[PDB]
Design a binder for these strands. Structure first.
Lengths: 44, 274
RNA sequence: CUACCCUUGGUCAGGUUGAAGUUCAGGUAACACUGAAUGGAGGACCGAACCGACUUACGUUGAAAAGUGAGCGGAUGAACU
RNA sequence: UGAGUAGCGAAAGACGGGUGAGAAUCCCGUCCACCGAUUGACUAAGGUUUCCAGAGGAAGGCUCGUCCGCUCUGGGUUAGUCGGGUCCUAAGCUGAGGCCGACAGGCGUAGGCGAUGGAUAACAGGUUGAUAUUCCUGUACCACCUAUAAUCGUAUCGAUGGGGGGACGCAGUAGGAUAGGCGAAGCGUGCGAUUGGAUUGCACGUCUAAGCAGUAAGGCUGCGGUAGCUGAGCUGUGAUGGGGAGAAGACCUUCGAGUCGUUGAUUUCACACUGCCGAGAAAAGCCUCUAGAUAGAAAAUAGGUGCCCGUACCGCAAACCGACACAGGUAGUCAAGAUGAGAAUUCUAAGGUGAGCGAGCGAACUCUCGUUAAGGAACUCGGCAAAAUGACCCCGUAACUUCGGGAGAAGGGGUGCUCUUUAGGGUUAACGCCCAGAAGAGCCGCAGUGAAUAGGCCCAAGCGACUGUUUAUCAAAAACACAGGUCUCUGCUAAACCGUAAGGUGAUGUAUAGGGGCUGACGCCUGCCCAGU
RNA sequence: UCCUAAGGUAGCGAAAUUCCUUGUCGGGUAAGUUCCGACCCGCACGAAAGGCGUAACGAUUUGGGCACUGUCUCAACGAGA
RNA sequence: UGAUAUUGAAAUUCGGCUUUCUAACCCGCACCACUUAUCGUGGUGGGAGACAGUGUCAGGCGGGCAGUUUGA
């Protein structure tokens, strides 16, 4: 059957990209939490 | 002038359609068209605010001249064409200087002459004249309410009004619905009655013919669930159950008047519709 | 993913039936009403692709956390993508 | 522990050589078998080195392994023209000032971003273990620079703007051409396995763009509005004193090989013409207009310049999504012969593949298939399942109907092969090639649509008119929807609705209109009560 | 003769509605708690949460026939996993 | 739906509901300028007008929505 996840390079960067997390105050608070925790990947 | 098909198939059994014999040009004016995308009854927030809207055939918008702005220039009817945006037809008039415009096609009008000016134009179908120069007893359409804004009343297929006695600054008029009110004498109006009077005698025939017009199904509130409609649901078919029928949002929808309590127009209405 | 909608694209081997209208010739004070051709309308007919899931068998620490075999429905449209 | 128990994931393999410590499983060869509207050939998304060569067998591969999409080492992607950027724009998303909000921030104008569409200059061969419209060979085209020659100027370049153009739906039939097919000795093979053959039996029969010619059919007649025009498939010279070429004389070598008349024909090349009602984006390139700017070599000569990103490989699959080397899912394009209406059916071509555990025996039982004497629903909650009917031609067919239907009603008869024949036809100097019928006379079998593919029907009731829709994953229905009917609210900054602010939908609509409740084609009808709410 | 705002009209009726109930009387069967046609004692039908009819349509429910058959009387043999 | 603030004039009238006038306030009304965009600002006309809109206080309706109770 058709599974839930269908990869798409463009749609993945427009929804969870770095530039879209900086366009919102709530999105910026996401990168501040990942930085404070020591993650190697910040977005995407 | 109403074609009636033969019962060769179901749905087409009792279906009827117009004749279109009054049309003379099946091609619009390329210089008077504009795009008109569909909204589907959704707000600028992206949410659905009006139900039963969606789909339909692609349409283009024709620019209509509801103000009739010019000085005693005589125009000529060039052709009558079909307009999908309204219930009435439209006529293309050409003026003695070359300007082309669109106007609503009155009843029983052919390729002749038309003039738009006050105190000089005659009382004949086609001419637009201020209510001051209109004697009591005439039938007018495309009536205005604000000087220079454009006609907004009696603009449907087979619609018109009747000019009653004038009273000082205002004139008494009887609208199609039956109401009587006053309008400023400086408002413009056109003589005659909107044509295409056999438009309401049509039988759609089948459900698919209304789908490509832009209407979606209408689910009755009595077959819904309790958390979806005040009529909710019981065991099997049930009556209304309440003292008065409700709307989808919880308001009486039978004989409850929704007109606002206080407004400026209240002084200009003599007797409501009956 | 799924439900509805918006803008812009694509797809449906083959066969069958023969509505309105039109045309000539008999009609007729005028119409009416008849014929033989032309004509190709339809949520129309049979049936692949494609889209659906009515019956039954098998499988149910399965090949598969919903499938497979054999029949079955729609198939120019309220169609599918 | 269960236990050396279940399982080892749809399918045809056999033998002879080679390698090696070790071979049913790796390599080569010959037979056999399977797909072939395809398991074949190209290409978007997605994956991200899985691609090539030599060298390896610990682990991974449901067995084995000398082998690998696994390990080690070294390699592989070449563009002015192909697809995207220095071009345009739909939806939508963001918007200097501005409007509105306890704070954040929500709306919105000019202006920008944004293809799934519009505009836009290259083709045919050759070559590597791994790239090819990119490299190479042969011939083209577009934009932009530089110098030097034709009119011996009161020409030239034009907007930031104006007007044309671009520019658009669905259905149906006919017609003109061309691809790919088929049949004939125009060329190269070759003529004999086992009984008689010798108009024997095989295979081939091609060639771009661009640039010059004239070309079926199409639309249109004396700057914008008012009162011998434009486009057009195909054909033919040459390009090509080349390229390719089934084969030949020689056991990345040199070298002279044939390109023709006839038939049948698109789903490819025109929204062209015609009809219909549901009435079918935009913008730029492009061609004009004058504002103004006040000065040349775009039909032509000889030389120069032209950037950035993608290009390997898989792509109905072992590489994509599914925890797996998983009977599942995944857009578009190319579409051969016999049979046929056909892309159905059976067998084959081009080109692929033989499935990653086997060998024996032929118990019970279970699963998937094939027959069965005499009865024929006696089975069972119930004809569940199975069986039967099935294509084409020709006769013929009831009650009821809203006159269209019912209807393929129900029933019955024909069907192979050979011969003898005669004013249907299409294409053409004849001839020949193709398509298609009515008669008569014969032959063979238990059987002639001899295989495969293809409606059981009929007499009566309940419900809903009808096509359609619904509980992804135990309910497809009498449930929802529907055309029609009726009540009621709304005169426009409309009612209703979201936010309940701005701003929006309704609607670029105006009572023949819009919102809400209840009924549910059509036909005949729809009675009485207003004390209560 | 009491009471009420008025005391159910046309049509239909053991019905997707009838508890008594397998009501009773006629059809179909050798045998019919189901089915069809009629009777009204309608517990508890009824006119737009409409009443009564209706051609054409249905992978809808229901009863009776023809054809056919391993469904069965009653089992037997063969092929493959 | 009333009181009061924003909110000023004149007259009728057996510390006043009502005809009445422009000057506050309002106009998804028109023509101009910013500007070859009408979102917005400003100016001139027209319409309306001390009403409407807005703040505080008060009364009524209000399963539309919310928190809870419904014994042994």
């Amino acid at each position: 059957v058709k599974r839930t996840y269908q990869p798409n390079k463009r749609k993945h960067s427009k929804v969870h990209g770095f530039r879209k997390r900086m366009s919102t105050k709530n999105g910026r608070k996401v990168l501040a939490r990942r930085r404070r925790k020591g993650r190697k990947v910040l977005s995407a | 002038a109403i074609k009636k098909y033969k019962p060769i198939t179901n749905g087409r059994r009792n279906m009827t359609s117009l004749d279109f014999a009054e049309i003379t040009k099946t091609t619009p004016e390329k210089s008077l068209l504009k795009p008109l995308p569909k909204k589907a009854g959704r707000n600028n927030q992206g949410k659905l605010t009006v139900r039963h809207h969606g789909g339909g055939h692609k349409r283009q918008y024709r620019v209509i001249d509801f103000k009739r702005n010019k000085d005693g220039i005589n125009a000529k009817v060039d052709s009558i064409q079909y307009d999908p945006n309204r219930s009435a037809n439209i006529a293309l008039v050409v003026y003695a200087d070359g300007e082309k415009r669109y106007i609503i096609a009155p009843k029983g009008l052919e390729v002749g002459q038309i003039v738009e000016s006050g105190a000089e134009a005659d009382i004949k179908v086609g001419n637009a004249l201020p209510l001051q120069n209109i004697p009591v007893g005439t039938v007018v359409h495309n009536i205005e309410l604000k000087p220079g804004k454009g006609g907004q009343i009696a603009r449907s297929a087979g619609a018109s009004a009747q000019v009653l006695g004038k009273e000082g600054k205002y004139v008494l008029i009887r609208l199609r619905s039956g109401e009587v009110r006053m309008i400023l004498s400086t408002c413009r109006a056109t003589i005659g009655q909107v044509g295409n009077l056999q438009h309401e005698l049509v039988n759609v025939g089948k459900a698919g013919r209304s789908r490509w017009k832009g209407i979606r199904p209408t689910v009755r509130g009595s077959v819904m669930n309790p958390n979806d409609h005040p009529h909710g649901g019981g065991e099997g078919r049930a009556p209304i159950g309440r003292p008065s029928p409700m709307s989808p949002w919880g308001k009486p929808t039978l004989g409850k008047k929704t007109r606002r309590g206080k407004k400026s127009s209240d002084k200009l209405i003599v007797r409501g519709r009956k």
